Each structure stands twice: as structure tokens, then as C-alpha cells.
Amino acid sequence: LAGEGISVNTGPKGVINDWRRFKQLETEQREEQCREMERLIKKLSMSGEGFLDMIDKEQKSIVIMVHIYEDGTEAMNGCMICLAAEYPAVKFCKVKSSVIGASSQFTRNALPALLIYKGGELIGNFVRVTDQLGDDFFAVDLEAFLQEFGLLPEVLTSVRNSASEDSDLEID
Amino acid sequence: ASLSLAPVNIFKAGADEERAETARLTSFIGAIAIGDLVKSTLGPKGMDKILLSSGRDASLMVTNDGATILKNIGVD
Amino acid sequence: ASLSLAPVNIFKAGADEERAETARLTSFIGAIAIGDLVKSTLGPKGMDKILLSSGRDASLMVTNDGATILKNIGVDNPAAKVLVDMSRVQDDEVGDGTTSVTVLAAELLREAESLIAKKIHPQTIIAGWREATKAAREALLSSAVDHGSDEVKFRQDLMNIAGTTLSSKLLTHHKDHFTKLAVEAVLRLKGSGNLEAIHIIKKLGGSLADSYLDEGFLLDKKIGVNQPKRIENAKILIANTGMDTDKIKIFGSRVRVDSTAKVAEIEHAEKEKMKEKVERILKHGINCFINRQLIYNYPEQLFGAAGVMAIEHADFAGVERLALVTGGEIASTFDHPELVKLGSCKLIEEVMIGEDKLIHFSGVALGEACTIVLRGATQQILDEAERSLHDALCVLAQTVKDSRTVYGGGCSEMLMAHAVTQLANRTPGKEAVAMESYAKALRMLPTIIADNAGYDSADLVAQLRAAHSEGNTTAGLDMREGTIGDMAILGITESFQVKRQVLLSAAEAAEVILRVDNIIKAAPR
Amino acid sequence: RGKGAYQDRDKPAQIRFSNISAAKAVADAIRTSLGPKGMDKMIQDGKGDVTITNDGATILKQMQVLHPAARMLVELSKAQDIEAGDGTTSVVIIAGSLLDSCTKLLQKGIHPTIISESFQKALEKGIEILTDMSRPVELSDRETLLNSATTSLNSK
Amino acid sequence: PLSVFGDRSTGETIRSQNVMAAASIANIVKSSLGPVGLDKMLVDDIGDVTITNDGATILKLLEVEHPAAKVLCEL
Amino acid sequence: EDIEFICKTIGTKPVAHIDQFTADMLGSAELAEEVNLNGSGKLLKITGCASPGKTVTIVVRGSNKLVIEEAERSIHDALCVIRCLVKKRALIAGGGAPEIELALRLTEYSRTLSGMESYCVRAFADAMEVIPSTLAENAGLNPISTVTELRNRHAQGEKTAGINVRKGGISNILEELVVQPLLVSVSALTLATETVRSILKIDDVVNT
Amino acid sequence: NSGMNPIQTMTEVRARQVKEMNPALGIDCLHKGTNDMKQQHVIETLIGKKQQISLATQMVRMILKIDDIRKP
Amino acid sequence: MMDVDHQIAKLMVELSKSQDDEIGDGTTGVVVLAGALLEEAEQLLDRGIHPIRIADGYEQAARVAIEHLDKISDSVL
Amino acid sequence: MMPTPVILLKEGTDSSQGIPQLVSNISACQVIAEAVRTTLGPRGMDKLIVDGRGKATISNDGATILKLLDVVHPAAKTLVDIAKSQDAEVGDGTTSVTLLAAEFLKQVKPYVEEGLHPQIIIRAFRTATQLAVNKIKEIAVTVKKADKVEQRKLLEKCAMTALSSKLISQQKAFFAKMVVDAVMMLDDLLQLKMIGIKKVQGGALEDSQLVA
């Protein structure tokens, strides 16, 4: 048992394919782990790729919130639909916890999750909103509660109007 | 080109080989370790050794014989 | 008892310790591993290593320099860290001898472990090594020869030293041309020691023999839009002023008026202030103006109207090199034109090197600053050529500072080993054995040099030892064919400072490593 | 002398063989993209970017090669592009063939330093031969310039 | 030997894949040619419904992975 | 960064303050028009300038982006070839003729040498023989027979004999207008030899 | 394996074999001072050499003929 | 005893075993000879020669070598 | 198509109908033919197939290669079946049958894509095959002399032609003479079990012998 100076040398450069494949897979799991860790412990104490690349994409100047649910979820979903009908500029969406594979404590004691993302960072991590909001409050109550913290953003055509750059020229 | 240091892989899973310098290094290290272990029990003033078995029996053996010491060791 | 081998454990988790035999074993293994790694890149026939980085950038580096090899390796053995720091300090002190000092330290520690196995107290080894180091240093100092008085002899010594330094590196293919280049570049310093005055520019493409030392100076900056691209008998004004929306340094000042007309008047006043500054600059009667900082559009236009070349954003090194090469004075105020010295050069023009355009200064006045253009086929070739040229320039500058020289090819090592042996066979005790081991390592250095070439190292070293014992104090290794020859005739010369530093640093590191009998590691972070 | 020095390490031989194999693989990769009858390659990077190219330098630099010898060949192609502009595939193929020959030379028991000096001698002789073969040309001769441009564009 | 971190196709394989991709793109819209052609319905992942006969609109709305299919769509 | 190019092309001197804005700093041009490219974008063209500068612009069009990029690369290659004609104005035949001539002459040189260096330079010539083999390949010709015919014709004294793809055989290529500048083959040979020597002076790999 | 230079020794032995007609000149592995294997009494069975050459040729022919691998 | 997984390595092992079974000596010469033959066939293939042609040439040369071995053979008591 | 709470077939049933499935079947047949495409002729090359257990099979025979291929495509299995049929009835031509069938399908694929009724293609194939078989029977060369030497020469030439595509093609005359000699000694039924074949490791091909 000697030769502590192994100096693997040519090994890493000769098997770099498998090492880089494993590194890529581990990093792919790493973005998911970093995204999910922002919710657990950080706020709990006090397909997944679709969610990941939806959070990564879109403009940082648009507030995007997501909801974590398991099968009063129905009332909050109806209120969220009403807010979506009232705030077309926002992109309300929901995703199951089992798809994300969050912790068991979040599944068992944090079923109602109001996660708000603004430019890749958590400006709001409302979790287990049963106590401070209720069970059967309407959409206007949720809108007022969210607007009190300054998070939510502040005619009707017939059906549609939108359709070279030569607009119109009468010049001879 | 070496048997193992080639882009194509010629071995099963877990099979390994060591070329000239590595084989010589490993053999010399093993032989020197065995010789240093068995020595210091040599001559009129040599000292004995304690052999503890890792099995369930955990047999205890105190000996000065070189063959006895070399028998009851797991050498790789 | 022992800290680790006690019924109660005194350590936190992850922290351990290594007692006498174990600590010595770990230190010796680390030192021998470092020495074996750095060696085989030693002497004229040494090969080069490949440093493949495992980082995200994955930098690729092919080098022969021992210091660069030892810097860019993940080292966990503390004795290996000590040897690496020794090599780095040696590189900082002098340009060469990093591999030599590392290998000497490794061989000394190998002899140390042999002596320890021979049941000799390490303090006896340290005392014997101190005596041997004193004797070897005295012998090396007595063997030194100086040629600073004679101009032609000193120049020949400089050429020989440059050749010896470049023999091991990749530049040995064009050794003669590269040594002429390096010697001319160092001699153009006119006694100054700042190697920063010599700028090495690496341009991809072209043969390695296409590298040349410019007779004037080369700048990699640009010129203003409406300014001349070629001026003769140029008068240079090197400056360090703002010339970029120059604000008054009263940070509490502001413009507070009640009409936009006053704002426009203040803006015109600012433009007039910049125009007055440009006029004050022009009052010096200049053709080219070089400013360290940026030059905005209005001063650039003002210079273009007067037909004055305006080179902008020449960094501190750039302005210092221009001042050295042209003799101008770096200025920041222009109220006393008579007190500011203007640089002068025969011609300024834009040259076309590779696919890039550079500003060329020809017929410079002082010329105490060199630009070396390196051409190569790969980036690794260019980097290694730059490192080798840096080593040669460092050794040449050290030789200029101290003109004492010693013979290479193992001759100095052989004479130091002979003196150490003569001391060793004159006193009793195990210190004699320690000094014999010291001499054995000193002799092992040229033995490794001969190994690298595939020659019969044992026979060559035996012949060298016999010649040095007989009285031939200039015999060494003739590497052209594998025999012993006269280094005085063959022109294989080294700087005395480099060899003295190698010997003393190797002895120091071996002494400090040998004194350790216990390695205690805290819990890693 | 008799037995001579005994090669204790033998690892440098493995390193040289690996480098030569990498260079030969690179040449075989960019071997079919040479000449008027050569075809193009499609390279899709980690992102969605797609490149269809016949340029040797572009092909070499567009794909990560992960091997030091291959990376040095990529740098060689880049240098040839910087100096000449074309012939980027030819120089890489030449280097690969040279290292192929070096393999057989090393197996015969030739030190990889006599090979270097011999290759330098051969390069000097070949430069002399090419200079002897060359023909003077004037910039006022539009036909030669048109022929050179057409020959350059023929393979694309 | 190449040691390139990726997949490689050469010879008949890549040509056949390119031709198959182009033929698939063709067969996507071959049913909407001429007066006897019939329209198609494109449904997004959010339920948006598009009914059209124009080939360019159909190719723009679809998600395309193969580079040759991308070439045909941009054509 | 476009200020220098615009000023060189038109002759306008940049103005940074309205005080210095005068008529003498304007660049007279024959015509400046914005043109639409058949509904695929708009381009503004300034064609015809008094005292024109030493700049030209090439507009590249194509069906898809990939062919546009390849056309740009090919045009750049052609411009680089003309540049290689500008400096070191020497011309050689293409078609693999320089490589086969180098192989033959270096084989003769090896025969004039002795020792292991003769074997090394013979291997150098055999490696230089590769390019004509690759040229004969990819065109349907038999590589061995074509290379042997090239070598025989070059030994017979035809320095300009090379591979012909139009006729599917070997013929004089100066009549085929296949020529390249000398500082393409020379540069490739020198750079390849330097790279090979650098690689040969390597014996170990270390991971940082 | 004996430490001698391969190419030089093989070339010298081949040249000697061509010059003086003696197919018994081989490689002096033991450094006995002579290249004639008849005096050195290095003797091999003809059947062994013939089998070596034949088997090597057939295996090389098979390996050359294979152009497809379908490992799982 | 070598634990190989490449099929060509298994073929080489079987070749050595066949040489051992038929003769009993020269089990190492066959492997080296086959490796050298395939190494030369590699550089022949690089030059655009059909592998069947290489095999036919190898067979012809092997026949010539066997005839030469028979010619230069010597008998013992 | 609607979920239809009560469904007709079992859940998970896959159905493909129309011209596209026929085109896919043709493409699968071409894929199968490509896997044995290069094994035809004196310049043909062998194929190596490794099973799950790690055993490697090297063969130039089309039927063997197709058998070792684990085809699951219903249309592709027809080519393997006809290769087995050709091996059973004849013993040679297993590579030719797959290539011929795939080329027939490739030639008629454009007509299928344009809406031609399959029955017309089937009738055309039947007529063409009948005419070709009649032509083969008409123009085939036969010698009605029953001369022993020329009949033996014919057997040897047929054996060499059937053997001049394998790794034993270098010794094709030797093995052909051996095979003809072995067959001539079979009595009336030419049973294959009457020709023992023993394989002994080691030795060259020319060392192989036929025992009387």
C-alpha cells in the first residue's frame, strides 16, 4: 500500500467521454436541485424539465407565478382562472409536486403553494396560505392580498386586427 | 500502443493490466512490504507479532515464525 | 502513547496525524514523486510535458519549464507543496534552474531516506549537509570566472549563456538565431534590469524562425479617424491626462440654472475648455500624441484638424515603454511646454503583421525598450517560445548584473561533489556518510542529464569523476555525441548566481523537510 | 556497445502513440472534404446551431476534440488560415500522415529526435523543390488571378 | 480515436436520414395541394386551434428538429 | 466601430461639435438610396462617390442561412488566395502535382542520404504521397493506379502532371487552369513540419 | 528484446544473407559473437514455422474479410 | 487466461490456442505475425486497396514463404 | 376519434392502414436487404453478430445472417422466411432472394405512392415471374451424353462457383474436388447425415482431408 502520488495522467483524457457524460447528467440534475431548494428549508422551515426551461425562459420584466398542487385546491384554482381572465399579460400556470418530486414534508403540510417568480428569483414564496387567506375566499380577496404587497401588475376589439415594409406611398 | 491505453477497449468490466514500469513498481512495493513486515522478527533479539482474525471466531495468535505470519494475512 | 493511538480520541472528525515513520514516509514519497515528475525534462535532450486542465476552460499547455509544470498540478502532499514553493521562489529569483533545484532536492531527500534506513539521526544528516553545502559553495565560488572587463569576452560569454539556457527548450531548433535575438534584446536595455521594457508579442502563423527583434518598437493600438497614418521625423508627446469628458474634480459641483439657454452656454463652455486643453497640447509643437487613457470624439477631431497622430488607450506599460524607447516624458499638465521633453523617432507607420495591423516606430532615439515578434504554428508553440525567451532574458539580465560565470554540463556539479567528498573523507562519524550522500546527489544530477539523452550515464559520470579527481576542473558532459569535453572550449557556460541559488535553495528545502517528524492535518473545508 | 541503455519507463512511447493516433483520427475525419470532389460536413453544436461547411479550419474548430494532439492540429489549421487563408485541410492531412510515418519509424527503434532533425532537412529540401517548381506571376495578368480564384472556389 | 463528445453519421446513413426528413416534411403538406386538397388543424399545447391550408403557416407552426426539415421550412 | 470604414468609403470627416460642422467636412456622393430586397428586408446603398476610398463591399444573397455562410467563407477563401498572390507572387500547379513531385524528389534525396535519417526522410516522402491519393479518392478513380501514374509521369519530366477530375484521369493541369499560389503549399509544409516536431518533443501528459 | 537496435541489426543481417548465401544468419540474441545459427545450434522444426505462417495467414484473412459488427 | 471482451481479441486467443494444439511451440510467434500483417494491411487499406485483394496477396506470399521454408529446410537424425 | 367509454378492441392495440403502412413495409424490407447486401459475390465480406450470451457468429451466408438478426417487423420477416425457404430447397442463393425481393419492392414503391391498385402490381409480378421461369428453363444449357468425365467437370465447376465467395475461396478447387468426390459416393438418396463433418482445431485448410 504505497504510491500515494498516483498521477492518473492519461486516464482522465482517455476516458473523458464517460466523465463528461456523467458531468452533464449531474449538472442537469443540479439545475433541478437548485430550483427546488429555493422553496424547501428557505421558506418551508419558516415534466421537471418543462418547469426548469419555463422558469429559465421568458422576459425578466414579466411576473410569472406557478402553483404546486396535488389531486380547497379547486376554489383557489377557480380564483387563479379568474385572475388570469382579469390579467391577460400574466402567464399563470400550475404543476404537480410529484412531477417536481419535492420533499415529503412539503407534500404533507404545504399543499397550497403560491410561488411567484420575477426574473429567475423568488420575489414571493407564499406557502400554506390556508391560515392567512382562508378556504373559500373569492378571487377579489386573493387579488387584494397579492396587490397589498406590490407584486401583481397595476377596450375590446371586434375579434382581431393584426395580420414587405412598403406601407403606402402615393409619390409619383 | 498499450493494451489498455488505446481508444478501443479490450477487457471485460473490472479487468485491468499494468505495463512494464507499473508492474515493476507494484511487484517491488509488494515484495518490500512483505520483507519489512517479516523482518524485525529476525535473529536472537527479534520480537513477536500479534495476529488478529477479522472473522467471527476472532482467533488471537502471537508468533515469531515467518511462515505463520505470512500465512495468516490477506495479500492482494 | 500517541494522539491517534490513544483510547480517548483528541481530534475532530476529519483531522488526523502522522507520527515519525509515517510522516517521513509520506514526505519522502511526495518529494520523490515531484522529483521524478519534474525530471526527464532536464538537459539538452529533455522532453516536454502536456498540462491538460480539468477546468471549464480546459486550457491546454505544453511546456518544458519546471516551475510552470509544478505550478499547475493539484498537490496534496505537504512536502510536495514545499518543493513546488521552492521551485516558484527559484523562478522568481532567477529565470533558470527550477528543474535543477527540484531534482537536487528530491535526490537529497532520497539519500536522506536511505540514511534514515541506515539508522542515522536526522540531525546528524542536517549537520553533515550543512558542512557539505559550505564546502560546495566555497568550491563553486572559487571556480567562478569573470569577464566583465573585456567587452568581446563578455559578449561571447553572454552568447554562450543564452545558448546553454535555450538548449533544453523548444527553441533549440533555431538556437543560434534565438540567442542572437535574446542577446541583442538584453544589450539594448543599456544596463537596466526591467524585463518589462522588453515586450514579447505573439502572432499566430508563420515559422518559428520567422520570429525577429524589431529595430524600433511596435504598438498594438489604433489611430484616430481623421489623422495621418504615417509621419516622418515625428515629435512625440506622451501624456496621462483625461481627454475623456474631462470633469472638474470638485465632485460637489453642479449646474443649477433656470433656463435651457444657460445650459447650452455651459455646454459650449465645456467644449471650449476641451479645445483650450487641445490647443495647449498643440503648443508643444508635436506630430504624434500618445495618451494613456481614452480619447473621445471631440479631442480626436481637434487633433485630426491639426494633422496630428493621436494614439489612445496605451496602458501604463505602453506609455512607460514608449517613454523608454523614445526618451519622452510622460506628462499630465501642459502649462510649461519648455519643461517637457518630447520623444523623437525617425518614422511612424502602420505595418501588417499576420492579419492584424500594428503601429511601428522606426529610428527611435533611445531604444531602451524592445519588441519581440514571435511567430509559430500553434498557440502552445507560441506560449512555450515565450516562456523559453523569458528564461533566456532573465538569465542574461542576471549575468549583466553579476558577470561571474561557471561552466555547465555538470562540470560545476562534479567539482562541488569532489570538494564535498574531499571534506567527507577527512572527518569521522556518520556526518561523513551524510556528506557522501550529498555528493552522491550532486553527482546524480548530471547522471539524470545523461539518462535523458540515452547515453551510458554510469560510464560518463565515472569518467567525469576521475577527471575531476585528477585535476581537470573544466571537464563536463559533451552532449553532441556522448563523451567528456572541455566546457571552456565548447562554450557551455552558466551564470554563477543561478548555480549558487540552485545549490542553496535545494539544501535549504531538504533541510527543512528532513526536520519534520510529524504531520498534523486539520479537518478539510 | 552491446546491450545499450534499457528503456525503463516506456510510458513516453505510449504517449507518442496516443498523440499519433489522435492526429491520424483527425485527418481521417477531415480527409473526405478535400478536392473539387469533396463533400461538406454538418456540425451541430451543444446549442441548436447548424453549420454546413467545407473549410478545414471551420470544421476543426466547430467540433470539440478533447484530445491535446487534436487541439494542436486545430491550432495548426487556424494558423494556416491566418497566414495563407486556404489549404487548411491539406496541412492537417499532411501532419496526420507525417505522424503516421512517425509511428512506423518509432517502432523500428529510432529516437524521436533524429526524426525531428530529419524532418527539418526534408522540409528544407521540399521548400527548395517547391521554389524551383514555381513560376513568376504579375498582378497585371488578370487571367492568372481569375484562375487562382476559380481553383479556390472549385472545392466549395 | 476521434474522441469527439457527440454522435457521428457518415456515408449512406446521413444522406438517407436527410432524405427521410425532407420526405416527411413533404408528406406533411402533400394533402393540401390543388383544389381537391383539404385543410389541416393545428392544436397547440394550450388548446389553441388553427385551421389552414397554407403550407408556410403549417410549417411555421410545427416544431421541427432535423436540420434538413428546418431547411425545407425556411425554404 | 463603423466610423473609420464609413469615413474611408465616403470621405466624410466626423464632426463632434456644431461649431466645426462646415461644408468642407461633407462627403459628396452620386446617389444614396434605400432599396428593398424583394420584400426580404431593406438595404441602403450609397453608390458613386467623388474621390472614392479604397474600400469595397460584397452583398451575399442565398435561399437559406447555411448557404449564405458557406458562400461568405468561400469568398473569404478566394480573397485570401488573391492576397497570397499579392505577397510572394509565385504560382504552382495544383491537382496534387507539388505533393507527388515532393514525394519523388525526397525519395531521391533519401537515396542520397545514409543512416536512420534516410529512413526518416523516405517516410516523410511517403507521407507527402498521401494528398494525391486522397485526391484520386473521392472522385471514383483508383488511388493506387492514379498515384503510380502520377509518379511515373513526374519521373518522366512532366512537372505539371496532375489529377484531372473533369476527364477522370491524369493530364497536364496548366491547360485545365488549376493553379495555386506558392505561399499555400510552402506555408502548409512549414507549419505542418513545425507542428509535427513540437508534438514529437512530447513524452508525458499531466492533469492540473 | 536483447537491447540491440532493431532496424540496424535486421538490415545488417539481411545484407549479409544477400551477400553470402546463408539463410542461417539470424539475430545474436545471446551475444555469442556470431550470427550463424547453425554454429549456435538454434534449431526449429519446419512444421512449426509452416503452421505459424499458415495459421497467421488464415486468421488475417478472416479478420480482413469481416466488415460488420452487431454487438448488443 | 486473459479476460478479453473484444471479439478480435478472442479470435487472436483462439489462434494462439490452435497453434498450441497443433504444434505446441510458437504460440507467441503467430500472434505477433498476425498483428504485423494486420498493421501493414491497415496502411494498404488507407491507400485504397480492397481487403480481399490484401488477403489474396497475403495468401500468395504465404505460399511462396512456405515453399522457401521447404527449400531451405534441413534434416536431422 | 373519441374516447368512447366502451371501446371495441383491447386497449393499446396499434393499427396502421393505407398507403403509408405499405411504404413503411417496403422501407423495412430495404433495411433488411441492406444488412446482407455486402455479402454477395467473390468480393463479398463477412458479418459478425454477437448474441446476448456473448457468442459471436461470423458468416457469409445470407440465411444465417438473417436468422441471427432478431427481426420483429411483420413485413420484414417475409424476407427472412424466403431466405430460409431458399436455403431449405436449394442451399444457395439466400443472399440473392432478399436483394431481388427488396429491389422489386423499391421499383414498385413510386407506383404505390401515386395510388396504383396493388392487384395490378401483383398480376404483373406473376406474369413476369412466369415468363422469366419459362425463359430460364428454355435457355438453360444441358448435355444429353451422360459422359462421366464431363459430368464430373460440370459438378466441379458448379462447386467452385458456389464456393468462390467464402473464406475458403482461395482453396476452392481443392474443396470442390473433395465435395464432388464425397457426393459421388452417396448411394441413392444423397442423405446429408451420410456425410460426416468433423471440425478439429489447429492446422491449415490444406491439412483438411476427406476420409473414404
Ligand SMILES: Nc1ncnc2c1ncn2[C@@H]1O[C@H](COP(=O)(O)OP(=O)(O)O)[C@@H](O)[C@H]1O
Ligand atoms: N549544451 C549543453 N551541454 C551540456 N549541458 C547542458 C547544455 N545545455 C544545458 N545543459 C544542462 O542542463 C541543465 C538544465 O538546464 P535547463 O533544462 O535549460 O533549465 P533548468 O536548469 O531549469 O532545468 C543545466 O544544469 C545545464 O548544465
Ligand SMILES: Nc1ncnc2c1ncn2[C@@H]1O[C@H](COP(=O)(O)OP(=O)(O)O)[C@@H](O)[C@H]1O
Ligand atoms: N479542378 C481541380 N482539379 C484537380 N485538383 C484540384 C482542382 N481544384 C482544386 N484541386 C485541389 O484540391 C485541393 C484542396 O483544395 P480546397 O479543398 O479548395 O482547400 P484545402 O486545400 O483547404 O482542402 C487543392 O490542393 C487543389 O490542388
Ligand SMILES: [Mg+2]
Ligand atoms: Mg534552463
Ligand SMILES: [Mg+2]
Ligand atoms: Mg482551398
Ligand SMILES: [Mg+2]
Ligand atoms: Mg518456443
Ligand SMILES: [Mg+2]
Ligand atoms: Mg452462393
